[PDB]
């Protein structure tokens, strides 16, 4: 009868009729990510353009319907999801152009190969073949090369499409009513007249910036230690008082950091964190690891994976003639159909991801109830941050004590403390500038603080003085190095995983909060204690009906992001990394280059 | 007999509102026998798709006990009557969705209600040896 009762049955119309429709979009995703042939990518973009068009098509009928009338808020969010339009509000030239740019990057990043210069037969792409040697060769010339090549062939050829991205996707800014590309980074976060559970926009930039502060000083400790082992793996490259060079931090951009342990174990006389060869020890395969995993979610309170998870799921990795990619992604489709597509190996990483993996999929499961666009988390962060929840907690010694390896007399002596501590913060820290600068140079662009030709100059400027990083040799205006990462040449944001690494220290705390966790921040287990599973469980099902203020206060009683928690994880470490560096230089100086001298 | 979701079967039993017991299956308060269900992720469940298998969730009002909801007339908030695919007239069955592939409770559940009524006719439907030459009672047809 009245408007609100109309627009709740065509939202449950919509979820009816949107369940199944998602529901065969992401079985041809699902297809192609166990199978790729040239038939499966033509099944996964009939039913994707079916759920694109349909998302449009019925925000003709949603936009039709007054937003401004219902005072609800649970509705109201799924009205808006509706009468967002996606990306196909422009005009009819630009959108396909700008979303054909899109798909063209996507393409040529990832095919793109780089070969010898005296051999042009010697050709490989990304992943593997650079990464793997840009994290473990002890020769300059040779990650050097493949910093460059990877840059040279393809950036050069993704920087005329960055050109034409820039001003086509701000134009899809400016027609939806946003200010840049960062507004529309800094409206995912968008909650509106909860009045005291509400979030503005450049609050965001405000966040950033205000608690990256209290990163600037520890990453400035860590970065005048790596400095310094780098200078021992590598001698006679870096100055003392220096930046990084950009093919020695574990990969190619700088990014993740842990591959710099085996050229920065402070103590390496003391037993290894890296469990790896005691998995290889017990002849262990993927799905030991994954029911290992569930027996860690059952011990924190959540419950076992059901039929689909082990009927349908990739958990191997085949190499035959049925390839796929292996990118452990965690997969909502509805319908009870929850997976993760995973390719393992027997690595304390890959059994950390998957906990990561398995976090999500658990998360998911704990939101199955919402209605279906609501069927997704109340942020972008939360998903990521809780996922990477069950890895910190089980990374722990505590956890490795309680698997069955690491024979259970295991010292507590500081040092191997301190190396956990350090090899951790390599990743969890040194993430941050290039989280912190890389979104906040996006921004720059988008926004216009750079002009469209001093792209390239402000990146690693930026990463002079902001991450500490220096490129070896110089880049003209042909390149663009930001566009030959991936997030940036396949649509993602990049401060989720800012917003991940503090949202995971607080829920870190609030999980040890009710376990009666006695030790410092750092030896917590939330093993075998389900208060805390429920305590992260009236928060891991809420989804988008309620905003991340709210569960966020229901979480860890705080209502802004908030890092204390890391720097409280990290403040022993802290003082150690005061202890040892001070027979060398605490910071690094941006006029210093591999190509400067 | 009827197939459901999962979370229909829950819905068919006394008490129990749900949304498929209002326009549907409506469930009584007294007349009530047994209720017995098993799973069919094999017959009416089809990995690739099979949807003779829908579900009405808009009627102008509830239902009464065991009433039988059959005629297909689309639904409007205030009637009057419609033209589609005009707006707010939204198809009333709309297709189940449940595939091999899928988990537990979405998997499409047998369910059959045993109503029992007593003694309005004689009694129709329900569920030793000799010995010789010791005193017994009896008990024949």
Same mark, same amino acid.
């Not at chain 1, 401004?68 to 996606?86: F, M, R, S, W």
């Not at chain 1, 040799?473 to 396949?490: G, I, Q, R």
């Given at each position: 009868?009245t408007?609100?009762?109309q627009?709740?049955?065509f939202?449950?119309?919509?979820?009816h009729?949107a369940?199944?429709?998602?529901?065969?979009?992401?079985?041809?995703?699902?297809?192609?990510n *166990?199978?790729?042939?040239?038939?499966?990518?033509?099944?996964?973009?009939?039913?994707? #353009?079916?759920?694109?068009?349909?998302?449009k098509?019925?925000? %003709?009928?949603?936009?039709?319907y007054?937003?401004?009338?219902?005072?609800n808020?649970?509705?109201?969010?799924?009205?808006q999801?509706?009468?967002?339009?996606?990306?196909?509000?422009?005009?009819?030239?630009?959108?396909?152009?700008?979303? *054909?740019?899109?798909?063209?990057?996507?393409?040529?990043?990832?095919t793109?190969?780089?070969?010898?210069?005296?051999?042009?037969?010697?050709?490989?792409?990304?992943?593997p073949?650079?990464?793997?040697? &840009?994290?473990?060769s002890?020769?300059?010339?040779?990650?050097?090369?493949?910093?460059?090549?990877?840059?040279?062939?393809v950036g050069?050829?993704?920087?005329?499409?960055?050109?034409?991205?820039?001003?086509?996707?701000?134009?899809?800014?400016?027609?939806?009513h946003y200010?840049?590309?960062?507004?529309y980074?800094?409206?995912?976060?968008?909650?509106?007249?909860?009045?005291?559970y509400?979030?503005?926009?450049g609050?965001?930039?405000?966040?950033?910036? /205000? %608690?990256?502060?209290?990163?600037k000083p520890?990453?400035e400790?860590? /970065?005048?230690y790596?400095?310094?082992?780098?200078?021992?793996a590598?001698?006679?490259?870096?100055?003392?008082?220096?930046?990084?060079?950009?093919?020695?931090?574990?990969? &190619?951009?700088?990014?993740?950091?842990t591959?710099?342990?085996?050229?920065?174990?402070?103590?390496?006389?003391?037993?290894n964190?890296?469990?790896?060869?005691?998995?290889?020890?017990?002849?262990?395969?993927?799905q030991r690891?994954?029911?290992?995993?569930?027996?860690?979610?059952?011990?924190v309170?959540?419950?076992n994976?059901t039929?689909?998870?082990?009927?349908?799921?990739?958990?191997? #990795?085949?190499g035959?003639?049925?390839?796929?990619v292996?990118?452990?992604?965690?997969?909502?489709?509805?319908?009870?159909?929850?997976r993760?597509?995973?390719?393992?190996?027997v690595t304390?990483?890959?059994?950390?991801?998957?906990?990561?993996?398995?976090? /999500?999929?658990?998360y998911?499961?704990?939101?199955?109830?919402?209605p @279906?666009?609501?069927?997704?988390?109340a942020?972008?962060?939360?998903?990521?941050?809780?996922?990477?929840? &069950?890895s910190?907690?089980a990374?722990?010694?505590?956890?490795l004590?309680?698997?069955?390896?690491?024979?259970?007399?295991?010292?507590?002596?500081?040092? %191997?403390?301190?190396?956990?501590?350090?090899?951790?913060?390599l *990743?969890?820290?040194?993430?941050?500038?290039?989280?912190?600068?890389?979104?906040?140079?996006?921004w720059?662009?988008?926004?216009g603080?750079?002009?469209?030709?001093?792209?390239?100059?402000?990146?690693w400027?930026?990463?002079?003085?902001?991450?500490?990083?220096?490129?070896?040799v110089?880049?003209?205006?042909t390149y663009?190095?930001?566009? +030959?990462?991936?997030?940036? +040449?396949?649509?993602?944001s990049?401060?989720r995983?800012?917003?991940?690494?503090?949202?995971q220290?607080?829920?870190?705390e609030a999980?040890?909060?009710?376990?009666?966790?006695?030790?410092?921040?750092?030896?917590?287990?939330?093993?075998?204690?389900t208060?805390?599973?429920?305590?992260?469980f009236?928060?891991?099902?809420?989804?988008? +009906?309620?905003?991340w203020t709210?569960?966020?206060?229901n979480?860890?009683?705080?209502?802004?992001?908030?890092?204390?928690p890391?720097?409280?994880? @990290?403040?022993?470490?802290?003082?150690?990394?005061?202890?040892?560096?001070?027979?060398?230089?605490v910071?690094?100086?941006?006029?210093?280059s591999?190509?400067?001298? | 007999?009827?197939? $459901?979701?999962g !979370? !229909?079967?829950?819905?068919?039993?006394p008490?129990?509102?749900? $949304?498929?017991?209002?326009?549907?299956?409506?469930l009584?308060?007294?007349?009530?026998?047994?209720?017995?269900?098993?799973?069919?992720?094999?017959? !009416?469940?089809?990995?690739?798709?099979?949807?003779?298998?829908?579900?009405r969730?808009?009627?102008?009002?509830?239902?009464?006990?065991?009433?039988?909801?059959?005629?297909?007339?689309? =639904?409007?908030?205030?009637?009057?009557?419609?033209?589609?695919?005009?707006?707010?007239?939204?198809?009333?069955?709309?297709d189940?969705?449940?595939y091999?592939?899928?988990?537990?409770?979405y998997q499409?559940?047998?369910v059959? $209600?045993?109503? =029992?009524?007593?003694?309005?006719a004689?009694?129709? $439907?329900?569920?030793?040896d000799?010995?010789?030459?010791?005193?017994?009672?009896?008990? =024949?047809?």
């Amino acid at each position: 009868s009245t408007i609100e009762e109309q627009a709740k049955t065509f939202l449950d119309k919509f979820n009816h009729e949107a369940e199944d429709l998602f529901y065969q979009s992401s079985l041809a995703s699902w297809n192609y990510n *166990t199978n790729i042939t040239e038939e499966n990518v033509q099944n996964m973009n009939n039913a994707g #353009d079916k759920w694109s068009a349909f998302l449009k098509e019925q925000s %003709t009928l949603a936009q039709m319907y007054p937003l401004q009338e219902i005072q609800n808020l649970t509705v109201k969010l799924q009205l808006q999801a509706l009468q967002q339009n996606g990306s196909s509000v422009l005009s009819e030239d630009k959108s396909k152009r700008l979303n *054909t740019i899109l798909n063209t990057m996507s393409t040529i990043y990832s095919t793109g190969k780089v070969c010898n210069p005296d051999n042009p037969q010697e050709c490989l792409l990304l992943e593997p073949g650079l990464n793997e040697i &840009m994290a473990n060769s002890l020769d300059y010339n040779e990650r050097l090369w493949a910093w460059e090549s990877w840059r040279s062939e393809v950036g050069k050829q993704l920087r005329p499409l960055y050109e034409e991205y820039v001003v086509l996707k701000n134009e899809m800014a400016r027609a939806n009513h946003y200010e840049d590309y960062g507004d529309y980074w800094r409206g995912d976060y968008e909650v509106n007249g909860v009045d005291g559970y509400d979030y503005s926009r450049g609050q965001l930039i405000e966040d950033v910036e /205000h %608690t990256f502060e209290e990163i600037k000083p520890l990453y400035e400790h860590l /970065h005048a230690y790596v400095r310094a082992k780098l200078m021992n793996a590598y001698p006679s490259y870096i100055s003392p008082i220096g930046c990084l060079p950009a093919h020695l931090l574990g990969d &190619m951009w700088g990014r993740f950091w842990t591959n710099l342990y085996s050229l920065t174990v402070p103590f390496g006389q003391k037993p290894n964190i890296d469990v790896t060869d005691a998995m290889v020890d017990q002849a262990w395969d993927a799905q030991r690891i994954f029911k290992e995993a569930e027996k860690f979610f059952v011990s924190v309170g959540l419950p076992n994976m059901t039929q689909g998870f082990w009927e349908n799921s990739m958990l191997t #990795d085949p190499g035959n003639v049925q390839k796929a990619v292996c990118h452990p992604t965690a997969w909502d489709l509805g319908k009870g159909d929850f997976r993760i597509l995973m390719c393992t190996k027997v690595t304390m990483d890959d059994f950390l991801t998957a906990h990561h993996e398995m976090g /999500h999929i658990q998360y998911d499961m704990a939101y199955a109830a919402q209605p @279906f666009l609501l069927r997704n988390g109340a942020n972008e962060g939360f998903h990521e941050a809780v996922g990477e929840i &069950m890895s910190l907690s089980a990374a722990t010694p505590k956890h490795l004590k309680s698997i069955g390896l690491l024979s259970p007399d295991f010292q507590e002596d500081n040092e %191997t403390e301190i190396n956990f501590l350090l090899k951790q913060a390599l *990743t969890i820290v040194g993430t941050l500038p290039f989280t912190y600068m890389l979104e906040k140079w996006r921004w720059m662009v988008f926004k216009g603080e750079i002009p469209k030709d001093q792209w390239m100059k402000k990146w690693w400027e930026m990463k002079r003085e902001i991450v500490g990083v220096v490129e070896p040799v110089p880049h003209d205006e042909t390149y663009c190095d930001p566009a +030959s990462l991936f997030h940036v +040449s396949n649509d993602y944001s990049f401060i989720r995983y800012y917003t991940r690494t503090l949202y995971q220290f607080q829920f870190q705390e609030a999980l040890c909060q009710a376990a009666k966790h006695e030790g410092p921040l750092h030896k917590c287990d939330i093993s075998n204690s389900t208060e805390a599973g429920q305590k992260l469980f009236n928060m891991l099902r809420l989804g988008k +009906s309620e905003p991340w203020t709210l569960a966020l206060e229901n979480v860890v009683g705080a209502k802004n992001m908030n890092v204390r928690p890391l720097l409280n994880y @990290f403040e022993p470490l802290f003082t150690w990394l005061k202890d040892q560096n001070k027979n060398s230089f605490v910071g690094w100086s941006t006029d210093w280059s591999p190509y400067a001298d | 007999s009827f197939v $459901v979701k999962g !979370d !229909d079967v829950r819905q068919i039993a006394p008490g129990q509102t749900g $949304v498929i017991a209002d326009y549907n299956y409506k469930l009584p308060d007294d007349f009530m026998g047994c209720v017995l269900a098993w799973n069919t992720r094999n017959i !009416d469940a089809t990995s690739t798709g099979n949807y003779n298998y829908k579900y009405r969730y808009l009627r102008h009002g509830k239902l009464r006990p065991f009433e039988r909801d059959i005629s297909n007339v689309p =639904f409007s908030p205030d009637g009057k009557p419609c033209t589609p695919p005009a707006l707010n007239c939204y198809w009333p069955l709309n297709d189940y969705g449940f595939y091999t592939t899928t988990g537990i409770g979405y998997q499409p559940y047998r369910v059959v $209600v045993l109503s =029992f009524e007593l003694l309005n006719a004689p009694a129709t $439907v329900c569920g030793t040896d000799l010995i010789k030459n010791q005193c017994v009672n009896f008990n =024949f047809n």
